[PDB]
Amino acid sequence: HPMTVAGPVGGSLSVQCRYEKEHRTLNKFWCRPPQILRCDKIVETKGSAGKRNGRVSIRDSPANLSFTVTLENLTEEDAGTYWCGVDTPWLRDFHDPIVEVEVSVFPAG
């Protein structure tokens, strides 16, 4: 459930979030944690946020039971805690992470 990833300012990083067979068909998303119950989705594979949102993109690989989030042109602001998550078809009032991801951005050494 926990995960940490790191990359340089100006660079790229990718996060691979593994899930279960029952999640194959579900909308997958990337977000900062909820302020209350639901998080504000940055990108999603099957939803309003879109598969690409500026520097952030998401791609589902149901055959490998994972999806990958890619963050491009990293800035120090991009550091922090994120959720990989899935939505149920009829949706819930809350979100859970399938993985909590801590992103670190270090100066381009």
Residue type (1 letter), 11: G
Domain that holds residue 7: 2-106
Q: What's the CA gap between 38 and 14, in Å, rounded?
A: 24
Pairing of strands 97-106, 2-8: parallel
The CATH number of the domain where 36 resides is what? 2.60.40.10
The resolution in Å comes to 1.7
**What are the DSSP calls for the chain, one per residue?**
-EEEEEEETT--EEEEEE--GGGTTSEEEEEPPPSSSS--EEEESSSTT-SEETTEEEEEEGGGTEEEEEE-S--GGG-EEEEEEEE-TT--SS--EEEEEEEEEE---
Q: Burial code of 56-88, b = ≥16 C-beta within 10 A, e = fewer?
A: bbbebeeeeebbbbbbbebeeebeeebbbbbbe
Pairing of strands 52-53, 41-44: unpaired
Residue type (1 letter), 78: D
Q: What's the CA gap between 87 and 26, in Å, rounded?
A: 6
**102 and 80 in contact (C-beta within 8 Å)?**
yes
Number of structural domains found in the chain: 1
